[PDB]
Structures are given as structure tokens and as C-alpha cells.
Amino acid sequence: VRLSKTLAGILRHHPGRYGVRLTREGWARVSEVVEGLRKAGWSWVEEWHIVGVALHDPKGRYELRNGEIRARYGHSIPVNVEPLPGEPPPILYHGTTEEALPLIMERGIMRGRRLKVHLTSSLEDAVSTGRRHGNLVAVLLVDVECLRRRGLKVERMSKTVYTVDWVPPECIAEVRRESL
Ligand SMILES: [Cl-]
Ligand SMILES: [Cl-]
Ligand SMILES: [Cl-]
Ligand SMILES: [Cl-]
Ligand SMILES: [Cl-]
Ligand SMILES: [Zn+2]
Numbered sequence: 001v002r003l004s005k006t007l008a009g010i011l012r013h014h015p016g017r018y019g020v021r022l023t024r025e026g027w028a029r030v031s032e033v034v035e036g037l038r039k040a041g042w043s044w045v046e047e048w049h050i051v052g053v054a055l056h057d058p059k060g061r062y063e064l065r066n067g068e069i070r071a072r073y074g075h076s077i078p079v080n081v082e083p084l085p086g087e088p089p090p091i092l093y094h095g096t097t098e099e100a101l102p103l104i105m106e107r108g109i110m111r112g113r114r115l116k117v118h119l120t121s122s123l124e125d126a127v128s129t130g131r132r133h134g135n136l137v138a139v140l141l142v143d144v145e146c147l148r149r150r151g152l153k154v155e156r157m158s159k160t161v162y163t164v165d166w167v168p169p170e171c172i173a174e175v176r177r178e179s180l
Pocket of ligand 3: 059074
């Protein structure tokens with residue numbers, strides 16, 4: 001029912017479901033997205049909403065170019081999006097469920113349905129993120145350098161969002177249980 005939430009699903013997980021075709025670079029035509037949303041019963045949707053959604057997103061979730069749009073990260077579909085300039089901070093956060101900690105302590109942070117593992121520089125974001133699946137959020141502090149030495153590359157997809165294949169258990173510097 002939320003336009004943005006729905007848009008991110010279309011550009012990250014199910015284009016065709018809405019008749020939208022994406023390139024390897026992840027791009028899509030705004031018009032094609034608009035029609036697709038209309039055919040899905042969103043009658044009032046117009047191209048300007050889509051631009052508004054993209055230009056006002058706080059996380060910098062989307063990108064635009066000559067009548068096109070794509071998500072910058074969070075894809076569960078194979079796609080290639082180039083990173084943004086800027087070395088990562090020494091520590092990056094990642095939210096999740098306390099219930100996931102037992103496993104994570106052993107295995108570390110695993111991929112999930114998304115292609116790569118996402119890490120945020122914003123503590124607040126990590127919380128709301130954890131709060132999205134299951135409750136009793138547990139935010140983990142990830143030592144980036146530790147990752148780089150593990151050889152795992154850390155790429156910047158948006159001002160506050162970065163990704164890596166996985167986070168080794170040993171690169172977790174702190175676990176904070178919201179229940180404590
Ligand atoms: Cl699909
Ligand atoms: Cl998602
Ligand atoms: Cl998100
Ligand atoms: Cl993730
Ligand atoms: Cl910056
Ligand atoms: Zn606006």
C-alpha cells in the first residue's frame with residue numbers, strides 16, 4: 001500500500017511481476033514502472049510520484065537518469081551497480097534478531113535472500129532494519145578493517161549503505177541486545 005516500499009520490491013525482487021524489464025545494470029524505464037503499477041491497480045500513480053519517491057528517499061535507495069530508475073542495493077536479482085566514492089568507516093552496523101545471534105556467533109553474517117550482506121553507517125538505520133524482521137533487535141558492530149584483511153571487499157552503494165559477501169564471526173566487534 002506504500003508506494004516506495006512497493007517500488008523497492010519491483011526493482012530489487014520482482015520486475016516482470018509488474019511487467020518491468022531490467023538491464024544487467026539494474027535500470028528500468030519510469031514509464032514502464034508507472035504503467036506496471038497502474039495495471040496493478042494503482043490508478044493515480046504518475047511519473048512525478050516516482051521521481052519524488054526517488055529524489056526524496058532518505059537512504060538514497062534509488063538512482064535516476066534520462067527517464068530511468070533502479071535500486072542502488074538490496075537486490076535479490078543478479079545485477080551490477082557500481083559503488084560510490086568514499087572509503088568505509090572503521091565500524092559499520094548491521095541489525096538483525098537476537099534469535100539470529102546464536103548461529104551468527106558461529107557462522108557470522110550470511111547472505112540471506114539478498115545477493116550481498118548489507119552494512120550501515122547509521123546506527124538508527126540498523127535498528128529500524130532489525131525491527132523489520134522479527135522483534136528483539138540485535139545490532140552488531142562490524143570491524144571493517146578486519147574484513148579487508150580477510151580479503152573481503154567492501155563496496156559503497158549509497159551514502160550510508162555498504163555491502164560485502166559475508167561478515168566473518170571474528171570481524172564482529174560488538175553485539176548490542178535491545179532487550180538489555
Ligand atoms: Cl519476477
Ligand atoms: Cl527487501
Ligand atoms: Cl532498506
Ligand atoms: Cl541484508
Ligand atoms: Cl560523503
Ligand atoms: Zn517532491
